[PDB]
Every structure is written in structure tokens, then in C-alpha cells.
Amino acid sequence: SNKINDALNQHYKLNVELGLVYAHYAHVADDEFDMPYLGKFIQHLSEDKLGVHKEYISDYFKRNGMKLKTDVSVAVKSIPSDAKALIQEVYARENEVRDHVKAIAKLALAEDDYESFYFIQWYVRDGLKDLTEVDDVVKLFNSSNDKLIIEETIKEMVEHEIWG
Amino acid sequence: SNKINDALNQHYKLNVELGLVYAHYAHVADDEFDMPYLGKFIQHLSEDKLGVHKEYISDYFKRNGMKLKTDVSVAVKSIPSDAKALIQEVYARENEVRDHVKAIAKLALAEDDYESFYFIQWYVRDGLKDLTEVDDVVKLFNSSNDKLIIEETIKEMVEEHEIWG
Amino acid sequence: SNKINDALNQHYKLNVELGLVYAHYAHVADDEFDMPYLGKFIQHLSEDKLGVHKEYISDYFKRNGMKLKTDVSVAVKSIPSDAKALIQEVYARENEVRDHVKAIAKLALAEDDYESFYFIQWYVRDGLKDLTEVDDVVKLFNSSNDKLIIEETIKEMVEKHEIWG
Amino acid sequence: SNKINDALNQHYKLNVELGLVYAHYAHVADDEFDMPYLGKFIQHLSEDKLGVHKEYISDYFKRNGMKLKTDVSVAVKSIPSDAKALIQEVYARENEVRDHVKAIAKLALAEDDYESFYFIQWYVRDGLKDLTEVDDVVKLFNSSNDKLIIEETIKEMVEHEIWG
Amino acid sequence: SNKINDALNQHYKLNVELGLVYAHYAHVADDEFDMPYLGKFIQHLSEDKLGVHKEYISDYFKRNGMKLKTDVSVAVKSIPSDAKALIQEVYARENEVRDHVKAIAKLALAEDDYESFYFIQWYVRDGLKDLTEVDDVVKLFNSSNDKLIIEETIKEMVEKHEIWG
Amino acid sequence: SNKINDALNQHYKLNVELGLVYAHYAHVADDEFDMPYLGKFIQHLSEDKLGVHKEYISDYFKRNGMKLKTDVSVAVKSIPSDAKALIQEVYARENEVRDHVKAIAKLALAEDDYESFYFIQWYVRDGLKDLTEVDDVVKLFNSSNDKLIIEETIKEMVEHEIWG
Ligand SMILES: [Fe+3]
Ligand SMILES: [Fe+3]
Ligand SMILES: [Fe+3]
Ligand SMILES: [Fe+3]
Ligand SMILES: [Fe+3]
Ligand SMILES: [Fe+3]
């Protein structure tokens, strides 16, 4: 169907934009806020969003017969005042890509299509995994106030049977 | 220096846009014209532009003290009708990137700023290397008109010189 | 979601109660019927119930932001007479667990909450797995009338699929 | 739960019949059109259809409580005229198998039998996997004409994370 | 030599039909008589019949120059009432396959076609081998009474000659 | 004997109830107080009581021929304010388990039941080990205020000839 194709192309575009903006965030975090390991963490998020997250969609298109568009336009206008607000912006972006995927899954079931449902299961799982990771990183900036302790913990972080 | 920073920001943006365009071309050539290994080759080029070619610039800006800006935008509305035309398209893109980086190198040598000359030497080398890598594949479509033989050749190709390595 | 949280609290308490009952049944079957291996089998089932089947629910709660409630109460006041009635009672308990899981799955699907659907698929599979594991032993008693042969069979069972496993 | 019982019996019968027809097709493709590796390919397809595809159904029947019925009748009288039409015929057969299994899955959801849905996910995936494996072979016959080149390619032709 | 051609086509048909029938019998034996290992044994017979027993005929046809024909008509509608009757049905089918292959061999030798004789010697041996393999398990249902001993013995048979090898 | 049977049934019931309560406390510590490693500590604590601590009793009952009774009543409706009060509550629980075991040992020695004395020696020895392992953690919340320091210390604590 064409509804499914539109939804998948929108998710493609969203993933590309997220990857680019995350890369910029990682750079500004490492360089301006004196936190290299936060930079590595957000860089890994950005490389994940520009890697398999869209290669899988392109592969599915080549496989079943849909066609692919390309329209991305991003520009960074502001950068949060501290590390905490930045990590919270990241948390919000992920929290919304979750609901985007939920909408796509409902649409899939309502269209008598089941290959698309079996396919979108992967994103249903990865969304929650990534959210719990970024939240476990968010929950540090309240348990402490020293910067180097948080950085050491993130260092030892950057090195399940259902949600795994 | 402001001119150096502006040229390097333009180069960063250019690499990003080329990477996106190459990935889309790879999908097209693998789905529309039935040549999977050409698709894998162009996809490798795409993973190369979106990879070290911008990480190095970001790291340099971290080191020397320059500022980064990100503003990209692309749209792929017209795509060639064959495989030969597609590979010649990407050939032209590489040939233009060569001239862009030569301009940056001249600008760096004029400003009496030698760390940037040292930095840009790597791009001076990699440009010619990638240009020959893609021209070697362009030369195939003038040898045979059989698709599967060209497929076998590019296949064995996807599977280093001292100076231009 | 609130009703999903109620259903999952229900299932948590159900699993805890079943685990305690199964531990008692294993002790009884070992000490009163002189069948130590039937005891080992039921005890493995009990350690399965009090183990993974509730830590998974706890982890899901800690991951999506729901609230866990704990209120259990159990008292085994009557046991069956022989081994066959015991194993048939165990069969009935498992068979009711199946129905409870189906209820939860339907409820989750009817209100557009798909993470819980993906979560509950595991329980959907494990239900039938455990049920056939139990019925394999249930069928043994109708195939003989001696006890020690059943002992040897259960032993070679406990000393041991792409879809259901 | 007899509706799903009947549907699964339909699928069992269809599987064995396709297996036999493919065995005959492989013999024909080897002996008549001088292509032994196309023979190997269709032979592996038939070994797949008569292999796990029906043992899984028998096992689900043994586990849940349904009953099995064997009822087969096959006759191969008219065969395609050349290799391309043969591989295209196989393509269409598997294309129809996909529609059949999708109908089974919709019926399974419509009856609140979630074990059946969980069971049929496997076929829903393997259908598209086999379909793309056969499409990859049928697309070779338009890329050249020398039968020996195509023989070499199919020779060198004999796993993903989602469709794996 | 259309005689040997029609005989081998008949044998192909019969092999496929007994393959399917053995599959169905293995199912009904595992599910209704509560004897899993007897089901494994009959399933191994089923998988043998549809296996090399017909690929050898099709391969000889390719290598020689005869024509192949497929036609199957199977319908299972009546099932024996216990395990003994089932294994005796299997016994009768094997005993008939022996007679069929003997007829084929005599026809081949009377036709002055010695390649068919050389080919059919394999089936001449394997028929007696498989008949002995089935008779060994037939003889079990007259030596004991409880199903579990028979299960253990069939299991040890299925987990494990210079002439009839 | 009879009094020994009654005391041992009491102890079995107590150990089961402690297991369940400690499980709940571990969950609430990890989720609400943002301390996952304390959660794992208390989780191993719980799984200890629902492990050997009751299987040993049931085994001894099978071995000398006493009668086992199960009856459990557990409902948690009050929870401490933060981690310190939590671990202090745990400390009180273990401290009470000690003197329950002492009462059992005295009763066993009075009635000239020496097999029960030899049995309860294990429970007598493995009360001071548990109490000192809990005290090592409860006296960490006196030295520091930066929750991540205590987190790392407990982490390294997770991963004797007489008492051991
Ligand atoms: Fe991800
Ligand atoms: Fe490069
Ligand atoms: Fe289980
Ligand atoms: Fe398949
Ligand atoms: Fe044989
Ligand atoms: Fe202890």
C-alpha cells in the first residue's frame, strides 16, 4: 500500500535528521562543555541512527517493491545552556520517535498487512532499549554534582533476553 | 583565521550532502537496474564520505580552536537512466571535489598557516586515490556489453600503493 | 496504562503463589509417595515460577514506569491421594495460566499499546512449552502400572525447538 | 478452534503438493535444458517444502490438540517450454503461497487464538525470504544470454537479522 | 526398453505413496498411542522412502535417456486400533515392495539389458535389509506387556554388514 | 519430636516472608532511589532466603520424617523515605533473625535432640556473615554524600576460615 510507504519514508527522513543533529550535539558537548565521554556516547547514538536504522528500511524497500524518496533539511539554531539540558533534549527526541513508531504499527495492522507488522517489531523493541539507555545516562546529573565522577561513570558505561 | 574556517565548514557540508546522494544512488542502482555489486561499491563510497571525511574536520576544529556550524539540505529529483550514466555522474562529482580541495590548499598556503597545509595534504592524496578507484570501474563499461561479466569483475574488486595508498 | 498494570500485578501474584504451592507439592511427592524424581521435576518447575517469570515483570516495570504492588497469601490445606492426581492438578494449574495470559494479550492489543504485546509474546510461547513438558509426564502413568520404570523414564527426562524453544 | 485447524490442513496439503511438483520441475530443468545448477536450486526448494514446512505443522498439531488429515492428488502433464518460463512459474507459485499464509494469519487474529498467530509468524517471514531468493535467480535471465555465464553465477550462488 | 521404463515409473509412484503414508502413521502413532519412539522409527522410514529411494531412479533416468512421469494418489482414511496392528501394516507394505522389485529384476534380465540388472541389485539388497529392520521391532510386541520397556528398547535401537550393509 | 517441628515451621515461614519483602525492597531501591547496585545487593540477599535457607529445612524434614506446613501472608504497604532507612530496616530484620535462631538452638539443646543441634549449627554460623555483610554497606552511608561514590563502592563489593 501507499500509506505504509509514506510512513516508512517519513521515518527514514526523521532518522537521517536525528543522526546529523546528534553528531553536532556530540561535537559541541566535547568541545564547549569539557566532557569528552558524553561526546562519545552521543556520537555512538548518532552513528546508530545513521547506520542500520535506515539501511534496514532501504533493504525492505528493495525486497517488497516500494520506492524511496530523499528530502532532508536541517539547521541547528541553538544549543542548550549546560550538559543536563542537552541530555534532556536528547531524551525528548527519543521519547517522541517511540510514539512515531507506535503510530506506524497501528497503521500496519489496520491495513491488512502483516509483513509490515513483523518488520516493525524490531523498531518497537529498539526504541525502548535506546530510551532506557539515554535515561540511565540522564539519571546521573542528579545523583552527583562533580563533573569528573559523572564522566568516569559514563566511561565505564560506554565499554537482555527480551529487550536485548 | 576566518576564511580557513569558512572553507572548512563548506567542505564539511559538501561531504555530508555527497554521502546522502551516494547512498540514494546505491539503492537506485541495486533496485532498478539489477546490479547488486555496483550497489555495494557505491554504498561503500557513501559510508566513506559520511565517515572519516567529516570526523577529521570535526577533530581538527576541536584541536586548533575553530567553531563548527551545521546546515545541510538535499533533494534527489532526477536520476540517470542507465548504469553507465550513473557511474559517470559520480566520476564528475569526484573530479569537482578535487578542485575544491586544491582551492582550500592554496588559500591555506597564502595565509602563512602551515598546520592547515599539513592537514589538507591528506585530502590532496585521498582525492586522487578515490578518483582512480572510481575511474577503474568506469573503464569497464567500455570493454564489454554483458552485464554479468562486469558484475563478476566489480565483485572481485570489492574483495596499497606506497605514495597514494 | 492502568489496566495493563493491574493485569500484570495480577500475573505477578499468581506466579508467586504457584511457585510456593509447587515447592510444597514437590516435597510431598518426594516424602510421601517415594518418588524422588517426580519431586525433582516439580521442584524445577517451582524454581522456574519463582525465578525468571517474575523478574521479567519487575524489569519491564522498571523500564516503562509502572508501579509494582505486593500482596500474597497462600495456605495448602489439602493434598491429593496419589501421584497421578497430584500431576493432574499440576496440569490444571498450568492450563489456567494459559488462559490468564491470553486474557492479558487480548487486553493489551485492544487499546493500542504494542510494547506490552511484544513483551507478552514470550509468556505466550512459554505457556505451551511448559504445558507439553508437564503432559509428557502425565501420560506416563496411563502407560504402565509399575513405579520404578516411571522413575527411570523421568530420570532420563530431567537429565536432558526452533519455534517453541 | 476448528477454523484454524482446517486452514492448517489446507497449508499442509499445499506444501506437499508443491514439493512433488518442484521435484519433477528440477528433473526436467536438468535433463532437458542442459542446466544442472538450476536443477540443484529447484531441488533444494523441493527439499525445503517437504522438509521442515510440514513437520512444524505436524508438531503444532501434536502440541495443541488438533487433528491431521492427509489428502494428496498431483499430476504434471504440461511443463513450460524453456528455462525462463519455468523459473517464472515457480515464482508465481510462491507468490500465491504468500497470499495464502497472510489470509491464515488474519483469520488467526480474528479469533483471539494468539498461539496460532505466534506460530504463523515464522511462515510469514520465510515466505518473503524464499520469494526474494527466487526473484534474485529469475532476474539473471534478463542480464545476459550465454547460458554458461548464468550457470557460473547460479553455481557461485549456492544471513539477515530481521528476515534471517 | 519401455518395459523397464514403465516398471521404474510404477516403482517411483509406489515409493512416494508409501513415504506419505508412513509420515501419517508416524504422526498417529506418536499422538494417539502415547509411544513417541515408535513414531520416530516410522518417521525415519518415511524420510528414507521420499529420500534417496527415488533420487536414484531419477538419476538413472537422467544418465540413461528414459522419460519420467509423476502421478500421486494418496488418501488415508482408516487407522489401526493399536500399535501392534500398525507395525504389522508396515510389515506387509515392506513385504510387498520386495515382490515388486523381484518382478522388476526378472523383467530386466529377460530383456538382455544388463545395466538395469546392475542398477536394481541395490534395491534387491535394500528391500531385505529394511524388512529385517522392521521385523526386529515387530517381534517386540510379543515379548512384553508394558509400553515403557518397548519404548526404551526402540530408543536404543534407533540411537545406534559385509553383505547386507 | 514436636516442639522442634513447630519451631522449624516458624523459621521456614519467616524465611519465605523475608525473601518476598527483600525482593520488593530491591525493586523499589533500583527504580525510585536511582541506585541500581544497591538493588542488586538486596536482590542477592532475597534470593539467598528463597534458596538454600528453606530447602535445607525441607531436606532435613524428609530425612528424619517430620511434617512440613506452608502458610504465607505478606502485604507491603509502607516503604522508607530513602536508601539509608531502607538498609537500616534490612539491618533490623537480620538482627532479629539471629535471636530467633538462638531460641531454636536453646530449645534443641534442652530436649536432648542433638541431631537438631548439629543441623542448626549451620544457621547459627550463617547469621553473623549476613549481618556483617549488611553492616559493611550500612556504614558506607556515614562517610560520604556523593551517591555515585557509594554506588561504585557497592559495585566493587558485589563482583573466612571460621565464619565464611
Ligand atoms: Fe537504536
Ligand atoms: Fe575517501
Ligand atoms: Fe516455562
Ligand atoms: Fe521455506
Ligand atoms: Fe532402505
Ligand atoms: Fe545465609
Side-chain angles (χ1 to χ4, degrees):
Chain A
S1 188
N2 284 9
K3 306 293 298 182
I4 314 296
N5 189 6
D6 305 331
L8 288 186
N9 275 36
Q10 291 299 111
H11 202 57
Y12 185 88
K13 160 189 183 70
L14 171 57
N15 281 248
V16 161
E17 282 173 82
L18 275 188
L20 298 173
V21 66
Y22 279 4
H24 183 56
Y25 276 177
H27 172 70
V28 61
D30 179 338
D31 170 53
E32 251 245 349
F33 293 154
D34 276 349
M35 302 197 68
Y37 282 97
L38 208 69
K40 268 203 289 181
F41 185 87
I42 291 178
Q43 179 78 27
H44 280 308
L45 273 173
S46 66
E47 301 206 310
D48 218 6
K49 287 298 180 299
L50 274 149
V52 286
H53 271 271
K54 65 178 183 72
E55 180 195 3
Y56 284 162
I57 289 189
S58 179
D59 184 29
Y60 182 52
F61 283 169
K62 282 194 291 185
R63 197 183 307 268
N64 75 359
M66 301 178 179
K67 66 94 176 179
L68 188 75
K69 283 188 173 185
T70 301
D71 183 75
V72 57
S73 67
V74 69
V76 188
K77 300 292 183 183
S78 294
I79 296 94
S81 280
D82 196 349
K84 183 183 169 186
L86 180 61
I87 206 70
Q88 287 180 342
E89 292 292 329
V90 175
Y91 177 79
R93 304 274 174 75
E94 184 66 28
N95 196 17
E96 255 326 295
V97 68
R98 270 173 80 234
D99 299 329
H100 195 182
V101 173
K102 184 176 89 66
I104 303 179
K106 175 193 182 181
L107 173 76
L109 273 185
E111 281 282 332
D112 263 8
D113 185 14
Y114 291 85
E115 291 181 357
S116 280
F117 196 58
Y118 171 70
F119 164 86
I120 202 66
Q121 298 311 282
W122 197 90
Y123 291 99
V124 162
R125 186 199 50 78
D126 191 84
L128 193 45
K129 188 179 75 70
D130 286 4
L131 178 67
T132 202
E133 264 186 342
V134 65
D135 170 51
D136 273 334
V137 159
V138 164
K139 292 196 312 174
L140 287 176
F141 291 78
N142 280 113
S143 67
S144 187
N145 187 281
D146 197 301
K147 179 166 298 191
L148 289 192
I149 314 289
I150 301 174
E151 293 185 1
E152 171 187 40
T153 299
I154 294 186
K155 159 184 183 286
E156 295 265 359
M157 280 187 184
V158 77
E159 284 185 351
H160 210 286
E161 182 56 28
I162 286 188
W163 304 104
Chain B
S1 167
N2 295 301
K3 314 186 58 179
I4 296 276
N5 200 334
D6 293 358
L8 285 183
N9 269 320
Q10 293 176 199
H11 203 72
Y12 181 95
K13 165 192 190 58
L14 163 69
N15 286 248
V16 169
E17 283 183 3
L18 271 175
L20 290 167
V21 174
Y22 277 2
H24 182 79
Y25 277 174
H27 168 88
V28 159
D30 197 4
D31 175 30
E32 246 180 351
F33 305 151
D34 305 327
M35 295 173 84
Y37 288 118
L38 180 57
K40 291 193 172 305
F41 176 83
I42 295 188
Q43 172 64 25
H44 172 237
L45 258 182
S46 178
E47 305 175 298
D48 199 22
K49 302 287 176 181
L50 293 181
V52 297
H53 281 227
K54 82 188 193 302
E55 197 277 330
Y56 282 154
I57 291 189
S58 179
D59 170 85
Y60 184 58
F61 284 179
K62 271 205 285 274
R63 281 177 199 264
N64 68 352
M66 299 189 184
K67 182 179 178 294
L68 191 74
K69 322 173 177 188
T70 309
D71 186 327
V72 311
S73 158
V74 79
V76 178
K77 295 296 300 170
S78 297
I79 64 186
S81 65
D82 292 330
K84 182 168 164 59
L86 198 69
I87 206 60
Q88 285 165 347
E89 181 79 30
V90 314
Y91 178 79
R93 305 302 194 86
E94 305 293 342
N95 207 6
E96 160 187 9
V97 161
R98 265 182 71 194
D99 203 331
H100 287 193
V101 74
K102 171 191 155 193
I104 295 183
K106 180 174 187 171
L107 165 69
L109 200 51
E111 300 254 351
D112 272 7
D113 181 47
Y114 293 84
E115 279 147 359
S116 314
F117 201 90
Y118 185 84
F119 179 59
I120 213 68
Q121 296 301 284
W122 192 86
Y123 290 84
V124 166
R125 174 202 58 77
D126 195 75
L128 195 43
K129 158 181 141 197
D130 299 355
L131 180 68
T132 76
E133 263 191 5
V134 75
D135 176 72
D136 292 332
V137 192
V138 173
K139 287 152 50 168
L140 298 187
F141 291 76
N142 299 155
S143 296
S144 178
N145 59 5
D146 203 313
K147 198 156 303 193
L148 300 186
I149 289 299
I150 298 174
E151 276 318 300
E152 200 156 329
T153 302
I154 306 181
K155 159 177 185 295
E156 265 296 316
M157 274 191 192
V158 193
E159 293 205 347
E160 290 179 332
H161 200 279
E162 270 55 57
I163 296 186
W164 308 95
Chain C
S1 175
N2 215 21
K3 183 49 204 176
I4 292 297
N5 202 358
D6 304 0
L8 288 182
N9 292 338
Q10 195 85 34
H11 204 67
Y12 177 90
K13 85 183 303 308
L14 163 78
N15 277 324
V16 186
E17 297 173 353
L18 277 188
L20 289 171
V21 174
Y22 279 4
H24 184 82
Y25 275 1
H27 165 75
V28 158
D30 188 359
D31 179 53
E32 197 165 349
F33 302 152
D34 303 338
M35 301 188 68
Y37 286 91
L38 194 55
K40 293 190 190 62
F41 178 79
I42 303 190
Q43 157 72 359
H44 284 293
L45 278 197
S46 89
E47 278 178 311
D48 201 313
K49 292 311 173 192
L50 286 166
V52 178
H53 286 213
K54 74 177 194 300
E55 67 183 2
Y56 277 3
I57 302 192
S58 298
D59 180 283
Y60 183 62
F61 278 167
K62 296 199 286 198
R63 197 176 302 251
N64 71 355
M66 297 163 156
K67 301 315 164 184
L68 168 65
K69 293 197 169 187
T70 314
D71 54 353
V72 307
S73 61
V74 66
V76 179
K77 67 175 188 174
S78 296
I79 77 166
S81 180
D82 72 337
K84 172 154 50 179
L86 178 86
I87 195 71
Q88 287 190 258
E89 189 58 36
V90 181
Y91 182 87
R93 309 288 180 85
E94 299 294 328
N95 206 9
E96 294 326 282
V97 165
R98 277 182 76 194
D99 179 21
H100 284 91
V101 166
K102 196 184 102 166
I104 295 170
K106 164 185 173 179
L107 163 70
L109 193 43
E111 70 172 4
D112 296 325
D113 171 65
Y114 297 109
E115 286 167 325
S116 303
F117 193 73
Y118 178 86
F119 170 59
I120 206 74
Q121 296 294 267
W122 189 88
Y123 285 77
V124 165
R125 171 209 67 85
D126 193 73
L128 202 53
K129 167 196 177 190
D130 294 0
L131 182 58
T132 187
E133 264 172 24
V134 173
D135 190 25
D136 289 332
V137 188
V138 185
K139 89 192 165 196
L140 268 182
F141 296 91
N142 303 117
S143 277
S144 178
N145 46 345
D146 189 313
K147 208 188 296 186
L148 301 190
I149 320 295
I150 308 183
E151 288 286 302
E152 184 176 17
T153 308
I154 295 176
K155 173 176 204 298
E156 288 278 287
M157 266 183 193
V158 308
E159 267 196 6
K160 193 70 181 179
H161 201 281
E162 172 185 10
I163 300 186
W164 304 105
Chain D
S1 65
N2 56 7
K3 312 289 286 293
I4 323 294
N5 203 359
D6 294 332
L8 298 183
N9 283 326
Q10 305 298 113
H11 212 69
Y12 188 91
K13 158 180 178 58
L14 165 68
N15 281 248
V16 310
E17 295 179 353
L18 272 182
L20 308 179
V21 174
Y22 285 178
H24 192 104
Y25 275 10
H27 173 79
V28 170
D30 178 1
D31 188 17
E32 217 156 282
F33 308 133
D34 306 347
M35 306 193 75
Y37 287 109
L38 201 48
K40 297 286 182 67
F41 183 77
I42 316 176
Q43 174 69 32
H44 280 307
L45 259 179
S46 68
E47 283 173 43
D48 185 59
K49 289 287 178 289
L50 285 169
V52 293
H53 279 240
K54 74 184 195 66
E55 178 197 325
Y56 287 157
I57 301 174
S58 301
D59 212 313
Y60 185 55
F61 281 175
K62 281 207 278 284
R63 290 197 183 205
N64 86 331
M66 298 169 167
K67 306 210 69 184
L68 184 72
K69 310 161 192 179
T70 310
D71 207 1
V72 187
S73 172
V74 173
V76 177
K77 316 200 302 183
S78 65
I79 60 193
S81 296
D82 50 28
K84 217 166 180 170
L86 191 69
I87 196 72
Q88 288 189 238
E89 187 70 36
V90 175
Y91 181 85
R93 301 289 188 99
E94 294 178 354
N95 198 51
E96 301 174 298
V97 170
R98 225 173 68 164
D99 287 348
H100 284 103
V101 63
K102 171 187 79 178
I104 291 179
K106 175 185 179 192
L107 173 59
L109 266 183
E111 300 264 10
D112 279 354
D113 188 27
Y114 292 111
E115 294 172 335
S116 297
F117 188 76
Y118 176 76
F119 175 79
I120 201 54
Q121 292 305 309
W122 194 90
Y123 295 97
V124 168
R125 167 198 61 85
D126 191 62
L128 185 43
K129 184 200 148 203
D130 287 7
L131 187 47
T132 182
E133 279 189 352
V134 169
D135 183 21
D136 185 296
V137 165
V138 70
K139 83 166 170 262
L140 289 172
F141 285 73
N142 296 97
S143 305
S144 192
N145 277 314
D146 275 344
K147 221 179 295 181
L148 282 180
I149 306 293
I150 307 171
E151 281 289 290
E152 182 183 355
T153 298
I154 297 187
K155 157 196 175 279
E156 276 280 306
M157 277 193 189
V158 299
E159 196 67 19
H160 207 269
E161 308 87 21
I162 298 183
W163 311 109
Chain E
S1 180
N2 310 134
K3 313 277 195 47
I4 320 295
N5 201 1
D6 301 11
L8 291 176
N9 281 342
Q10 275 291 117
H11 212 60
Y12 193 93
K13 186 201 203 77
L14 195 81
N15 274 317
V16 168
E17 296 178 10
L18 306 185
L20 296 179
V21 166
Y22 284 1
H24 187 105
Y25 278 9
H27 173 91
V28 67
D30 196 317
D31 188 43
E32 251 172 82
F33 303 145
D34 304 354
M35 300 174 79
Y37 284 114
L38 191 142
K40 258 191 196 170
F41 183 83
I42 304 194
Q43 174 70 57
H44 264 298
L45 276 176
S46 177
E47 193 274 331
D48 203 334
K49 290 288 166 177
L50 282 170
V52 292
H53 267 266
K54 73 174 184 62
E55 309 208 350
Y56 281 156
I57 288 185
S58 68
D59 205 316
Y60 176 62
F61 278 168
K62 289 190 286 186
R63 208 181 294 251
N64 194 355
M66 309 177 181
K67 306 287 176 292
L68 185 69
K69 290 186 180 182
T70 188
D71 213 328
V72 177
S73 296
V74 171
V76 187
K77 65 181 73 66
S78 66
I79 302 299
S81 53
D82 47 16
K84 194 163 61 178
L86 184 79
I87 209 67
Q88 297 191 217
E89 294 294 327
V90 176
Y91 191 77
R93 312 299 182 80
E94 294 298 315
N95 202 1
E96 275 193 6
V97 158
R98 286 174 60 234
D99 180 6
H100 277 67
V101 59
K102 167 160 97 153
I104 291 185
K106 174 194 171 178
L107 167 70
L109 193 45
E111 272 267 346
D112 291 331
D113 187 62
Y114 298 111
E115 298 211 352
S116 297
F117 200 75
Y118 184 87
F119 169 80
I120 212 71
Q121 296 293 270
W122 189 88
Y123 290 83
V124 163
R125 167 195 71 86
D126 189 76
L128 194 65
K129 170 193 163 195
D130 281 0
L131 183 88
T132 302
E133 185 174 16
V134 160
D135 191 13
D136 263 348
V137 77
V138 170
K139 283 181 180 166
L140 280 183
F141 289 80
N142 307 132
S143 296
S144 179
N145 299 334
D146 62 327
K147 288 186 177 182
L148 300 192
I149 313 293
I150 303 174
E151 296 312 309
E152 287 281 336
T153 48
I154 300 181
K155 158 179 184 294
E156 194 81 30
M157 275 185 175
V158 77
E159 85 168 3
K160 309 294 279 193
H161 202 278
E162 292 292 328
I163 295 171
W164 312 96
Chain F
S1 181
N2 198 1
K3 298 182 164 301
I4 289 297
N5 196 339
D6 313 309
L8 289 178
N9 294 301
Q10 293 295 109
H11 202 70
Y12 184 95
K13 173 188 187 72
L14 174 62
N15 270 286
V16 174
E17 296 188 10
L18 274 186
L20 305 159
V21 172
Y22 280 165
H24 189 178
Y25 280 175
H27 168 91
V28 78
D30 201 328
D31 164 74
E32 195 188 317
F33 303 142
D34 293 341
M35 304 196 72
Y37 276 113
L38 189 63
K40 292 190 180 65
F41 183 80
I42 312 184
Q43 177 81 49
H44 286 60
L45 258 188
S46 68
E47 293 183 348
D48 184 45
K49 314 274 177 186
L50 290 149
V52 289
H53 270 239
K54 40 178 275 296
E55 83 173 9
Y56 280 156
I57 284 184
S58 82
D59 162 65
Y60 172 61
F61 278 164
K62 281 193 282 186
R63 196 172 294 245
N64 71 359
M66 295 182 179
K67 287 83 185 177
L68 184 90
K69 298 157 196 163
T70 196
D71 176 20
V72 195
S73 178
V74 159
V76 179
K77 49 197 184 301
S78 296
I79 292 294
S81 297
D82 203 86
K84 205 168 78 185
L86 204 79
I87 197 70
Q88 288 181 6
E89 177 70 47
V90 176
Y91 195 42
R93 309 308 194 106
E94 299 293 322
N95 190 337
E96 241 281 334
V97 166
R98 290 172 59 206
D99 72 3
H100 282 173
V101 179
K102 148 183 289 201
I104 293 187
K106 176 190 174 188
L107 169 60
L109 193 58
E111 303 280 302
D112 290 354
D113 192 10
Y114 296 108
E115 297 180 327
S116 298
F117 200 77
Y118 187 81
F119 170 65
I120 212 70
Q121 280 302 277
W122 185 92
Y123 281 102
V124 165
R125 170 207 58 92
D126 199 83
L128 202 65
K129 170 183 178 179
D130 282 332
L131 199 82
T132 191
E133 285 185 4
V134 165
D135 189 55
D136 292 333
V137 176
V138 69
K139 68 188 181 189
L140 271 166
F141 282 71
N142 283 142
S143 296
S144 176
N145 299 347
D146 188 278
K147 209 187 298 179
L148 295 179
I149 318 285
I150 319 177
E151 278 282 298
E152 184 182 3
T153 304
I154 300 165
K155 163 199 191 305
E156 205 78 24
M157 273 188 180
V158 171
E159 76 157 12
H160 191 239
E161 193 277 333
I162 295 188
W163 303 109

